[PDB]
Design a protein around this nucleic acid. Structure first.
Ligand SMILES: *OP(=O)(O)OC[C@H]1O[C@@H](n2cnc3c(N)ncnc32)[C@H](O)[C@@H]1O
Length: 646
DNA sequence: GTCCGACTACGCATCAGC
DNA sequence: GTCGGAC
């Protein structure tokens, strides 16, 4: 058949008959791109999962070995996260490859990509070089995926030119809508509306409806034929939960897909279980906007409150053989980053401990002062090839959960149990390995003082977790089972700044057409200058963003006003007449190496920016001169508890 | 509530142009 | 990291 007319969203989809490729033959990338079209067209997640499941069903029945690349293409992933593969292709490089492939000038394609907010639309609607040669052989799914890995593997000098040539070869072989999705994949903005959770749902539904390991033609193609609506409903969720719980234990398609294709979904938890050395998905936290919101949602269930430390999450694995591994919250290998940690594993556990998986937070520590250092100090550590002698920023560990212990998994255990084992079999070495400052209560005043004390002790806020009711480490049940209580979540903390809009940025994707971001500035009275302080991109409603785009479009200037100073900040696409004042909330103030706001008032060669800036409201009663001054910004930074604890 | 994709600062690691 | 939108 023709991959051009592939419709994986048709009613009564047959995996074998409605396919556009013969069995044993490699899956054409156009079939993947056609499935991406139908997925992008709809907004309901259930319709998106069904369309993908249909494509996965034809793959599992006609070309099983192509299931792994098709899943990775739908996720826009290069492979397992612990392998650390990265494309290494910037937007400027992708645009240079698009311009060279289409025969157009770089300025033409760059203006169009910014105006459209999508590189895929530019790379597709340009084929002035396709009428130059005979059509290259059609693209395959596994072939496109391997070429993506080829790009990611090129390193060293002159590697950029080699990446461009591979991207160029893909575009000249693209037909119909393939160029739009290949360019979207390289830029890291697939924009499908479907991601990890929906792919997992589509995979479990596809292998349940069309089981793998069958002979061809497949005896079973729709195992939900003789079932009722509520029966097929509850059967698919039970199957989807088996896949989701094991993927949370082993988020590695390279390990799950082969076992899946050989033993089926039923026997998967027997082969892929939680084990040290293999990173697992961490437990996340849902943001709570107040103490009262914690009493609800948890209702009549006992919980605990722990200090929210400002560092980097460290998932530490101790294998039975003695080898030690550390993983980030994205399952990235961080073992070579903490040699100081590895030397101290003996000092944290009892002689009876043989294997464990620890959930801790690596926080920068000052041994000469016995205090916690801010996150900016922690980020100055080296990332790889670190030798313990040259470690200049010490790290203190704050363990708050225990997942594995002596060969048994505690995932299905309540937090009250996991916390107990973590206390009995681990030792306190202050400034090295300490337990999270905990406090079990239900008193609002006690919780309020604990929230205050945490920030006095160089912490962001509190973490609230139940102890016995829904207090397991099963992410597939609820990925955000913990609660997050910070000061800036409450609407009275007062860290609101009134800043002037001095620039706008063209939006991409969901923000194509209007402004996606804005440049904010503070007024320096002594220099009579507006100093850029940060960029702003979140906090607007969709209706507010169109009001800003309309109101600020009249103030667009061809050149910046002479009294505006942005230093090394990103030059805005549209310079704006300094007139709009917006209220902006942030979590912290940081010493910036780029922004010139309040430079000299705290550090001689560094300014101040805002950590996690968000838009609150427009200050219509205010004018640029009445905005927050750089002197106020310098004082706000000084009054910070971590800055005061210095 | 869930899932997804807009967008933030920052600094190490990497590479093009000279 | 924060945030809002569609379901
Ligand atoms: O805001 P966020 O989602 O990054 O917060 C979650 C992260 O916060 C870190 N952290 C610090 N202290 C704790 C405690 N006591 N418990 C759990 N997490 C904690 C972690 O890095 C977490 O991912």
């Amino acid at each position: 058949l023709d991959p051009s007319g592939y419709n994986p969203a048709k009613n009564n989809y047959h995996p074998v008959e409605d396919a556009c490729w013969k069995p044993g033959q490699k899956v054409p990338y156009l079939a993947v791109a056609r499935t991406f079209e139908k997925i992008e067209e709809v907004s309901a997640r259930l319709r998106m999962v069904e369309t993908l499941s249909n494509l996965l069903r034809s793959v599992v029945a006609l070309s099983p070995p192509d299931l792994l690349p098709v899943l990775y293409l739908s996720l826009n992933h290069l492979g397992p996260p612990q392998q650390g593969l990265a494309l290494g292709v910037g937007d400027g490089v992708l645009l240079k490859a698009v311009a060279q492939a289409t025969g157009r000038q770089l300025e033409s394609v760059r203006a169009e990509a910014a105006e459209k907010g999508d590189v895929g639309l530019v790379a597709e609607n340009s084929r002035s070089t396709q009428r130059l040669m005979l059509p290259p052989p059609p693209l395959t799914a596994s072939g496109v995926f391997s070429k993506f890995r080829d790009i990611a593997r090129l390193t060293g000098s002159a590697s950029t030119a080699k990446k461009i040539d591979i991207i160029k070869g893909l575009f000249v072989a693209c037909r119909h809508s393939e160029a739009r999705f290949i360019a979207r994949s390289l830029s890291g903005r697939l924009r499908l509306g479907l991601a990890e959770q929906s792919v997992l749902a589509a995979l479990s539904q596809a292998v349940s409806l069309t089981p793998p390991g069958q002979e061809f033609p497949p005896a079973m193609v729709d195992a939900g034929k003789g079932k009722t609506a509520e029966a097929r409903k509850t059967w698919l969720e039970e199957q989807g939960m088996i896949l989701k719980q094991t993927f949370c234990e082993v988020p590695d398609l390279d390990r799950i897909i082969p076992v899946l294709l050989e033993h089926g979904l039923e026997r998967l938890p027997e082969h892929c279980k939680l084990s040290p050395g293999i990173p697992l998905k961490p437990m996340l936290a849902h943001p709570t906007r107040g103490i009262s919101e914690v009493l609800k949602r948890f209702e009549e269930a006992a919980f605990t409150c722990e200090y929210k430390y400002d560092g980097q999450r460290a998932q530490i694995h101790a294998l039975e053989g003695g080898e030690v591994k550390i993983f980030s919250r994205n399952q990235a290998d961080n073992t070579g980053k903490y040699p100081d940690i590895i030397s101290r594993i003996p000092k944290i556990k009892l002689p009876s401990v043989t294997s464990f998986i620890l959930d801790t937070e690596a926080v920068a520590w000052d041994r000469e002062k016995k205090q916690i250092q801010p996150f900016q100090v922690l980020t100055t550590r080296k990332r790889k090839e670190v030798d313990a002698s040259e470690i200049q920023v010490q790290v203190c560990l704050y363990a708050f959960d225990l997942i594995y212990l002596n060969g048994e998994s505690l995932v299905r255990e309540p937090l009250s149990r996991r916390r107990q084992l973590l206390r009995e079999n681990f030792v306190e070495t202050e400034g090295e390995f300490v337990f999270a400052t905990s406090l079990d209560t239900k008193d609002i005043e006690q919780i309020a003082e604990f929230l205050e004390q945490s920030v006095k002790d160089s912490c962001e806020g509190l973490m609230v977790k139940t102890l016995d009711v829904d207090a397991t480490y099963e992410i597939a049940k609820r990925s955000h089972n913990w609660l997050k209580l910070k000061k800036d979540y409450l609407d009275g903390v007062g860290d609101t700044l009134d800043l002037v809009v001095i620039g706008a940025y063209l939006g991409r994707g969901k923000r194509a057409g209007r402004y996606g971001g804005f440049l904010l500035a503070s007024y320096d009275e002594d220099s009579e200058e507006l100093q850029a302080i940060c960029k702003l991109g979140t906090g607007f409603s969709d209706e507010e963003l169109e009001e800003h785009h309309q109101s600020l479009k009249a103030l667009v200037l061809p050149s910046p006003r002479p009294y505006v100073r942005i230093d090394g900040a990103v030059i805005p696409d549209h310079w704006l007449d300094p007139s709009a004042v917006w209220e902006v909330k942030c979590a912290d103030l940081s010493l910036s190496p780029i922004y010139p706001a309040a430079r000299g008032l705290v550090d001689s060669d560094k300014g101040i920016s805002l950590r996690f800036p968000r838009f609150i409201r427009v200050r219509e009663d205010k004018q640029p001169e009445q905005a927050t001054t750089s002197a106020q910004v310098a004082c706000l930074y000084r009054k910070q508890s971590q800055i005061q604890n210095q």
